Write a protein that binds this ligand. Structure first.
Ligand SMILES: [Zn+2]
Lengths: 135, 112, 77, 91, 180
RNA sequence: GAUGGGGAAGCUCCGUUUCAAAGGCCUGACAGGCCACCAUCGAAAGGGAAUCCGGUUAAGAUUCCGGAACCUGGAUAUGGAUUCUUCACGGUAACGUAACUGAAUGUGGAGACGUCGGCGCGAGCCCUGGGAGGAGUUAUCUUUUCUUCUUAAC
RNA sequence: GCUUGUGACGGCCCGUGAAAAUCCACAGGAAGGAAUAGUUUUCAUGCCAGGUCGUACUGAUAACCGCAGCAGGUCUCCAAG
RNA sequence: UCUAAGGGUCGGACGAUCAACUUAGAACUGGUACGGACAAGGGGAAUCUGACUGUCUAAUUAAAACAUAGCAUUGCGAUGGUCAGAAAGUGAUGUUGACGCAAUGUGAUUU
RNA sequence: GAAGACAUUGUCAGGUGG
């Protein structure tokens, strides 16, 4: 079956975001005119959140838990599946086939997912995702 | 045929004291002292040549900016773009197999 | 030395407080079958690097020679 | 074409150094310079160099071996007795 | 000895080797300058400080690059690895073995040579092993030995057929050629 | 080839990191903490930061003069970029652009590397067509013979 | 076409044909920092400075060594028709 | 003085343009001489020796002398073998370990 | 770790012995 889904998590293998985890939102098994291959709109991060401890202050954790999102189109072959998953309904409509244009769209689309990942990582769900794969 | 003089005091045909000839405005040939070649930097895992990088003399790298000695992704100025891909998924799969051994050991100690 | 393609870029290199001196050169060359036209070369002593500008038209030369400041020390040829 | 009857591959040395020696050096010269089977690729692209080494350009892997072969009969028998003795001692 | 990369030595008998094992990895396999046998750049993780500690083992046959070595005392019996000789039974063929524990090897080092454990004195620990010459000798168990023959057996079978090859041979080790 | 050290009746010798208390920091309130070597000498032909042309003298020039570039090490102002989403964006990817912080420690790369053969590529020189200039043979023949027509560093 | 340089290949060996100073990057992330304003001096511009010594000459059937201005000897580049 | 063969670049069976010296083949000709100069192997039938490339008695000897790869033997398992130091907390082989280290007679081959 | 009142080191006496 098409075990790849849009509530799914994956990894990047190439193109300036490898070694960083992502999530699928919109697969296209035969692509489009542009992106003429099986691709998927995805989102992930660019700067992982640093670890925190007991003794850190509010300001320290505030500095450490800033996080950089990203959104990109990718060939399927340049990813790897993952058994883990994530809740995806929050940021479905902000991203779109047209959202990768006129980056007034793109930057707000980054900011929504920035707040989303921040509120998620605080009271951390998907700890495995939010921690950096080491390599 | 005009004949040419070494400009430096080393007379010998060494690796370094090399000679390219070039004709000049004033109408007399002279020798011109080329310097040694670069080499492609290489892959610490692959032993392969890696792209995007300027083949420059080693101190000469200090002049150029960050871009020419680098590419964008992680493991930029050292690696192959395939050896990275191999090791990353190695680190992912055996990271999952750590969980596999976790479920094995917790199963047998639960049996104990 | 370096070459210029934009004059709106150019016109502050002549005001950048490193220049004291600059010059103009004129050149006699022929375009494809064309006709023999003079060709202006405005050169300016940027101290770290000489900046030039090649121009074929003479009306633009008369424009720029007047547009440039009076204090700047130019020579010809 | 097969351009000779019995001298074969070592004919560059010529008429020198004796036939009884030419035979043995020929026997080893065919063995050293041929291309051998990769354990991993399964390809006849495995070449020696700097005697003792054996190297597949395909998949870039290298392995030690005989001075003039990939592997010895002693390698075979120690491999087989190890396959025995590992299973014997482990259980 | 210009080009001699490093002595064909063993690791030291540290706490890991002595109460457990360790995984150590080969990076390449290189021809020694003036040796009948090849060597192996092989690396471990120094467990007291954060770095990858290089080691220079002798290259037994069968071993390839991209290979691991579990090694110490609790290592599974496999080619390329190392143990002190008490855990194995008789008959396990080894090489590059030690005279005393931690001397990093005197015996069974040359090309295509090996030694053959035949006996044990488990109480009052020793181990009985034959030499390539064939002289029997019983030594303590805590000293070690690498599995398998030294690679390159049959280096000796080939003649040389001309003097320049012998000059190229004996330029490298020692000026013991031309001999009277 | 020093010092440590040990011998030597002794001049001085064996040895070169080893039977050594060998050296310096990093915050931070005189107390805690980390690191690990070992000297130094030896290549005007090996490695190695970076320059060209023209002119000039009785005699030297990659040295001087005229012009034009480069390297290293400093300070420090501006421009530009990044940012109220603080440590840029784009491209499937190969990788890119004018930049786009970062210590201790770790890892990797260059420096760093044979001989011979044949094959390709380009540089210089050689053969030379046409044109424009200068010289020379021409009793007789030769739309001829010779020379110039160039352009660096960066 | 001649010489020379480089490249991609191939052979060649029980010969496999050096190490260091130096430079750079990468992983790592101690920590620092903006909104009424900072950060970036590995981008561009802009400013001062670069010390000691050698440097001429010949390099040879006269400039050196051969008791000498000796039919001798001394490493090497350019190499036309 | 001729012929034939050996090519690129441009068009959709072949054609237009562009250029090289390589060989072969047929004539005509004169001192019947012609690699014309210069440069440039004399060859062969028998006997013996060392196997060979190679090395040397500069300044009376350049071999049937020396080394050579091979063959066979002997020694040594590290407190070891060879070898050295004024003595040492010494030192080479040795960053080595019996397919090794070292000394032997002998020198390719058939037998 | 091995070895241990033996070794060994300092000094004496036999056999052999260019
Ligand atoms: Zn392979």
């Amino acid at each position: 079956a098409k075990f790849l889904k849009a509530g799914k998590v994956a990894v990047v293998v190439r193109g300036r975001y490898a070694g960083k985890k992502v999530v699928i939102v919109k697969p296209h098994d035969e692509g489009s005119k542009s992106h003429p291959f099986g691709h998927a709109l995805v989102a992930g991060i660019e700067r992982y959140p640093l670890k925190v401890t007991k003794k850190h202050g509010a300001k320290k954790v505030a500095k450490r838990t800033k996080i950089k999102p990203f959104i990109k189109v990718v060939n399927y072959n340049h990813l790897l599946p993952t058994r883990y998953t994530l809740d995806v309904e929050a940021f479905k409509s902000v991203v779109s086939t047209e959202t990768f244009e006129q980056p007034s769209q793109r930057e707000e689309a980054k900011k929504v997912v920035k707040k989303a990942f921040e509120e998620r990582h605080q009271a951390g769900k998907n700890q495995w995702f939010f921690s950096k794969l080491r390599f | 045929a005009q004949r040419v003089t070494f400009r430096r005091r080393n007379p010998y045909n060494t690796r370094s004291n090399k000679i390219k000839v070039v004709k000049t405005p004033g109408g007399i040939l002279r020798a011109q002292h080329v310097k040694k070649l670069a080499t492609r930097p290489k892959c610490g895992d692959c032993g392969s040549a890696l792209q995007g990088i300027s083949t420059l003399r080693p101190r000469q790298y200090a002049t150029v900016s960050k871009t020419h000695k680098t590419v964008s992704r992680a493991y930029g100025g050292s690696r192959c773009a395939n050896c990275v891909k191999e090791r990353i998924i190695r680190a992912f799969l055996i990271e999952e197999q750590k969980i596999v051994k976790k479920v094995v050991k917790e199963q047998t100690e639960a049996a104990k | 030395a370096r070459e210029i393609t934009d004059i709106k870029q150019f016109l502050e290199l002549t005001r950048r407080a490193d220049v004291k001196t600059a010059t103009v050169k004129i050149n006699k060359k022929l375009n494809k079958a064309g006709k023999p036209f003079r060709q202006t070369k405005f050169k300016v002593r940027g101290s770290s690097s000489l900046y030039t500008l090649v121009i074929n038209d003479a009306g633009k030369a008369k424009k720029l020679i007047q547009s440039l400041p009076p204090t700047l020390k130019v020579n010809r040829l | 074409a097969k351009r000779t009857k019995k001298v074969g591959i070592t004919g560059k040395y010529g008429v020198r150094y004796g036939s009884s020696l030419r035979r043995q050096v020929k026997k080893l010269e065919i063995q050293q310079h041929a291309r051998y089977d990769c354990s991993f690729c399964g390809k006849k692209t495995v070449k020696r160099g700097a005697a003792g080494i054996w190297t597949c350009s395909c998949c870039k892997k290298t392995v030690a071996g005989g001075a003039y072969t990939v592997s010895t009969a002693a390698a075979a028998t120690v491999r087989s007795t190890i396959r025995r003795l590992r299973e014997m001692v482990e259980a | 000895t210009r080009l001699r990369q490093g002595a064909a030595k063993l690791r030291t008998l540290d706490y890991a080797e002595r109460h457990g094992y360790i995984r150590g990895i080969v990076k390449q396999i290189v021809h020694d300058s003036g040796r009948g046998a090849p060597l192996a750049k092989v690396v471990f993780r120094d467990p007291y400080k954060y770095r990858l500690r290089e080691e220079i083992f002798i290259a037994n046959e069968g071993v390839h690059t991209g290979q691991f070595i579990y090694a110490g005392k609790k290592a599974s019996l496999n080619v390329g690895n190392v143990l002190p000789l008490g855990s194995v039974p008789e008959g396990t063929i080894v090489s590059n073995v030690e005279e005393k524990p931690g001397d990093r090897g005197a015996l069974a080092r040359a090309s295509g040579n090996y030694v053959i454990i035949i006996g044990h004195n488990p109480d009052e620990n020793k181990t009985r092993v034959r030499l390539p010459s064939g002289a029997k000798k019983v030594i303590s168990s805590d000293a070690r030995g690498v599995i398998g023959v030294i690679a390159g057996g049959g280096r000796v079978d080939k003649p040389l057929l001309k003097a320049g090859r012998a000059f190229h041979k004996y330029r490298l080790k020692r000026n013991s050629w031309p001999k009277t």
